[PDB]
């Protein structure tokens, strides 16, 4: 099969900024190769196929050129409406295959973590489980590393990490961790705590809950 | 215009076979080819293979014979793609996309449909346990905690709607075959707790609908 790679899998922009993505075949694909354009709720268009031709209702600000190995798709004045992923796919040679995706995102100024943590509720003491909860609200830029520790002692068993898409308001990220233990385990220990690596800061960002507090 | 419709999400089980369906309108059906497309969540798009309902001519992904089988039914203008032997691995949202330029072709995808999302699982219809997050500043912010549910969606809402700024609900995880997700909510620390806050929680395919007032611990 064809490999194609598409030079970042991210990428910042500024509305009204000219932006490039790129990619690039294992071997020639003759011109052979279309841009899609997926949005969060999963639908899918075609902006242009033969390395350049634009179909037929999609704005002319977007732009497509290249040979060989080697293409780019250009939108030569960022919208809002453009946020979005973007797929390139060779049609050289069977299988088409795909590369792995650019997803575009609104550049804005670096932003710390609000870092929030939660102790399990009695409701869920009952049950004989504990999850204890930490919001990282509002960040920029979106990589972000979280570490758990029970009475200083780093845990990484238990724990689950979800992630929000940029806010569509404010251009920043959010995550949740969870920590599940044992009720057991849980009322064995005292502090928990989380604390979140992140560009804006260089010591660790710490939020701690204490059973004796 | 053309259009393309895709039936709805299934949940299957493991071992099992699903067939989903691919509703062409705005353009002659059969002389164009249909493809189907892969996208499992985390990862970009691998193609199934393809068929042409003008004479069922097929073509399969070497990864996918044996797994999936296309058909195409002429009188209603409607794609099937039947999925085999069904695993974790197949859990994924499946487009199906017309060619542009007929028979002869051009490997360029003019029109999509709207994927279908496959989810397989052994689990079968739960509903939520919801948690309430308090904490023990101008603003101060609670959550709460949706646990243990099957399948897909929830929706969570604060005070009915009215905080709508200043709330994230996080996507769901999987984990021991049920999802749980999070939802946090900042308000002003002169209204919490004087006033109340409460997540609304529901869970269509359980037919529950959970309010739970967050209160302060002590």
């Known amino acids: 099969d064809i490999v194609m790679t598409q030079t970042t899998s991210s990428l910042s922009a500024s509305l009204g900024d000219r932006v490039t993505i790129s990619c690039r075949a294992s071997?020639?694909?003759?011109?052979?190769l279309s841009w899609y354009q997926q949005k969060p709720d999963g639908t899918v268009k075609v902006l242009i196929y033969?390395?350049?031709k634009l179909h037929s209702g999609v704005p002319s600000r977007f732009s497509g050129s290249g040979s060989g190995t080697d293409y780019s798709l250009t939108i030569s004045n960022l919208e809002q409406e453009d946020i979005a992923t973007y797929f390139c796919?060779?049609?050289?040679?069977?299988?088409?295959?795909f590369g792995g995706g650019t997803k575009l995102e609104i550049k804005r100024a670096d932003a710390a973590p609000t870092v929030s943590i939660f102790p399990p509720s009695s409701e869920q003491l009952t049950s004989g489980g504990a999850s204890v909860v930490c919001f990282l609200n509002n960040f920029y830029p979106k990589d972000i590393n979280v570490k758990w520790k029970i009475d200083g002692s780093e845990r990484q068993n238990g724990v689950l990490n979800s992630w929000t898409d940029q806010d569509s308001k404010d251009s920043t990220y959010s995550m949740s961790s969870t920590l599940t233990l044992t009720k057991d385990e849980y009322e064995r220990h005292n502090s928990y705590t989380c604390e979140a690596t992140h560009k804006t800061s260089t010591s660790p960002i710490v939020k701690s809950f204490n059973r004796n507090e | 215009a053309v259009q393309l419709q895709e039936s709805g999400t299934v949940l299957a089980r493991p071992g099992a076979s699903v067939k989903m369906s691919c509703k062409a309108s705005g353009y002659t059906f059969t002389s164009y080819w249909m493809h189907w497309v892969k996208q499992r969540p985390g990862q970009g798009l691998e193609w199934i293979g393809a068929?042409?309902?003008?004479?069922?001519?097929?073509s399969y992904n070497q990864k996918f014979k044996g797994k999936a089988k296309l058909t195409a039914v002429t009188s209603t203008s409607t794609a099937y793609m039947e999925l085999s032997s069904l695993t974790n691995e197949d859990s994924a949202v499946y487009y199906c996309?017309?060619?542009?330029?007929?028979?002869?072709?051009?490997?360029?995808?003019?029109?999509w449909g709207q994927g279908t999302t496959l989810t397989v699982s052994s689990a079968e219809t739960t509903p939520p346990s919801v948690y309430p997050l308090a904490p023990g500043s101008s603003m101060v912010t609670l959550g709460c905690l949706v646990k243990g549910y099957f399948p897909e969606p929830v929706t969570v809402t604060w005070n009915s709607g009215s905080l709508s700024s200043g709330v994230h609900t996080f996507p769901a995880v999987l984990q021991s075959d049920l999802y749980t997700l999070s939802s946090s909510v900042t308000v002003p620390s002169s209204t919490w707790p004087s006033q109340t806050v409460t997540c609304n929680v529901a869970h269509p395919a359980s037919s529950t609908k959970v309010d739970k007032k967050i209160v302060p611990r002590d």
């Open positions: 071997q020639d694909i003759s011109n052979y």
């Open positions: 796919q060779q049609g050289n040679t069977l299988p088409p295959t």
């Open positions: 033969y390395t350049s």
């Open positions: 068929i042409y309902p003008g004479n069922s001519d097929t």
């Open positions: 996309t017309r060619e542009r330029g007929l028979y002869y072709g051009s490997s360029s995808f003019d029109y």
